[PDB]
């Protein structure tokens, strides 16, 4: 019942009080998100949105949380949906 995550200095504390939660398949989630951190950090800088991937669910579902203002959230979600759709095909 405890989760730890780092927060960069440039992310304001006021915009962390309303996550967005989206659910989708775990097997595609692991392959799309990847393992390394450099590309992920660059993506977070580009879209100005922070994301964390959780796979504690027992089923084939994984939880993805995105933080930011509504425009940034929408753009970042669209990027992920397009990437996942391309990877699935």
């Amino acid at each position: 019942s405890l989760r730890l995550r780092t927060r960069p200095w440039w992310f304001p504390i006021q915009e962390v009080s309303n996550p967005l939660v989206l659910y989708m398949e775990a097997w595609v989630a692991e392959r799309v998100i990847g393992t390394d951190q450099a590309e992920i950090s660059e993506i977070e800088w580009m879209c100005q949105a922070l994301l964390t991937v959780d796979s504690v669910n027992s089923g084939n579902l994984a939880e993805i949380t995105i933080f930011g203002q509504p425009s940034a959230q929408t753009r970042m979600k669209n990027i992920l949906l397009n990437m996942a759709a391309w990877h699935k095909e």
Binding site: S1, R5, Y23
Partner: protein, 949 residues
Amino acid sequence: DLQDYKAHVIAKFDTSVDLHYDSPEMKLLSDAFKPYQKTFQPHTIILHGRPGVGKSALARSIVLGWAQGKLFQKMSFVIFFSVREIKWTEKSSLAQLIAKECPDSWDLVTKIMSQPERLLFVIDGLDDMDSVLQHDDMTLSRDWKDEQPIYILMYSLLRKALLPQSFLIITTRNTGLEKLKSMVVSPLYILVEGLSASRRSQLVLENISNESDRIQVFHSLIENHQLFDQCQAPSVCSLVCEALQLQKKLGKRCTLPCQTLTGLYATLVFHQLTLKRPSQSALSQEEQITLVGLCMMAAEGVWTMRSVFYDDDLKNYSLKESEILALFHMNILLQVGHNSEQCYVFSHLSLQDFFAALYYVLEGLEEWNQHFCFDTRLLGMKRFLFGLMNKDILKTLEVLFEYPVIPTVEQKLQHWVSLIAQQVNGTSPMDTLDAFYCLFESQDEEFVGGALKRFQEVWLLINQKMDLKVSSYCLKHCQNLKAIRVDIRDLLSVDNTLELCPVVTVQETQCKPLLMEWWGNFCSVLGSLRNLKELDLGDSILSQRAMKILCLELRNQSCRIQKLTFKSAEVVSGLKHLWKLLFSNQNLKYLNLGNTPMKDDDMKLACEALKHPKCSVETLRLDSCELTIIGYEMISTLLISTTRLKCLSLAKNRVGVKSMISLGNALSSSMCLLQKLILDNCGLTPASCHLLVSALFSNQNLTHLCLSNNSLGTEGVQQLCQFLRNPECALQRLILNHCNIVDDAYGFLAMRLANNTKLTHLSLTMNPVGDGAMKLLCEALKEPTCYLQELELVDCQLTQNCCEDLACMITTTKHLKSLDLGNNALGDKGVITLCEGLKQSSSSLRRLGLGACKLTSNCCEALSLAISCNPHLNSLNLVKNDFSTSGMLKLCSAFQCPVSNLGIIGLWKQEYYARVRRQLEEVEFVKPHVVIDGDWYASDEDDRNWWKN
């Protein structure tokens, strides 16, 4: 002696067996004290999170792991502090605190000699010292063994200025970080969360009443972000589940709602209060004094940023713990502390905010003062105060206190909510949405109905489902609104989305997402109003299904909308359903359809529907659309047939020669009944315009005509004069904003206007005219047989030579009422000689535009004298000019005369000194109808901007 300290420290902290382990969330913290970049090695780590999460457990487990091993091995020493358990006023020294923490004292001398290279501190709390900080000036302490109250030592150790090159770990609150971020030097921030989302969903699901309304109550509880955020801590989730179970048990006895935090908290607290009473009765006087003192103490603590509540605070309000325990029986105001002094902190911050809110209701019931001996942090208190105005809580409070409850603050809340609606330049949607949320918190019909009665205009942004629900709920009680605007950018952007959050579906059979249900409810609420007549789609992007639902629900028999707008929306999928709606609702008579591309089939269907006798639209716009020649043929075929359109626009789209001749043939016949036609920004050649005027020659139906931003030759203007000279023309307004007309054309126009009626408005903006042709125009309109009222010359090449002619024209004329001089080099001599004849006032002009005419402070006296005695003048404009102080004072003194009747004045007041501001304020004070605004062209008395919408 280090092993003895190790044994003592493992002995003292031992409270968690299965809570501390080699979790993967702890290795990150262990590796955190390593250089991420080769250059940078962090020295201070600050932990933050929600107030209820177990952070003190993390610090305690860190110390225990150091004492046992496999957590911090290079670290030779750790020290734990707790500031919420020690007073922060007495004078002490770092040695004294370290001796209090460390049983032995002979170790520190060898410790500080060489260890500061490796020496770690662990600190808990530090969020309640945001109030002691005087903010004026504090002396930094550079070395220990100093007698000085401990808060200064905390400041000094925080600056890395007392014991440098020493690692620190700090635990604090999210809202206590406002003053701390400028104290530490290059930290590393780590964020802590509570439970996950799926676990929260399942826990809330397991505790619902399930009385045939489980879906709505569940979704209202879960989608509310404000409640779900603080439901992160396990304690608050347990409290909410307990309250729901309590409501389930005594279901018929509770009239309080279960959709908001205020209801559940009131349920729990009042049930606990009533448990102590053997029978339903009134609280005794001493119980009343105790309750009042506790609530008012919570209120002051919230105000002053204190959450420790020392014993002297308890004494000052004549309160004791035994009475609280006897009266409440609930875990309220727990006692913490191990020394002689005691500390009293509530079981949560939510309870303190709730009691602070409850204070304001009970303030004026009696005079309690005799028995007492004396913006982010206030969100919870404000929300709770809003929610406590429900009538059932008030009734229970009346029963308890044997006195009717009429709180004073209700009038103040109603006044504040009303002040938003009456705004001079429209309503800011942020305040409107915030007020909607706060009013949905208080589920009272009377309060909501009394709050929303002066809105008359609404603008919303919808990007969350709870926003849809709160807007749909609160809109039913707005009975004066007339225009709305919805900006749904991305919620409905994707057509299809079928997914389930939990492992199994929440409901056995849904078959249709909740979002579609809430959208349908909002659209039906919009459709069922009475006084609403204008609907605007704003900046939204809709799919097929959303448009289908909107069209179906707007076919109802109670909707009275007359104007429909789509000028910035992508609705290309649902145009079929729009055409279907077009001929089933007869109350609409205005359709704006700009910027949406149309194919052949869409235009064919639109034309077929528009011909249906049931249809009743009188205005239609199709600007910036991509049309074809077949589209123009269908436009002509619709135009000739029996229809009810009176205004048609074809702006911002190139028109071919075949289209031109087809349109001219269709328009030429006498069976086409049109009043107005707009054709600006289209690609017409001089030949095409010649055929257009030749076709218009035989028509006697149009009254308005626009040909702006077009290429017009001398043959075209000559043909236009030929057509408009002969009788039964019935043209009243002419629009020539950018067609290049020059030389002999103005002579023709002056000859025509010399003796001609039925012409009322004429504009010649952005056209190359000097003084020579304006001479002819003024001479022609000088005659009594002209009936023009308004002349527009905003961007003509007009100079100061003809100002004498202008003055004579003004003093001699008898008909025209408006004069615009926008971007002409008028100078000062021209303006003074114009006002020389303007002051005498032999005419009845009412509108004069003198913007951007290069006016200095030398012409102020003449303008002041002219406006001093001229009761006919009504409007004026003076923007984009400079003025000295003395000239402005003279003008302001002229504004204050009892004879003037100025109604609208065009100025920007935020570009002068203070004295001119005060004089303008006094001008506004004496005359209560003068409007001093810079948006001079937004005032529309008669329909002047009819071609721009």
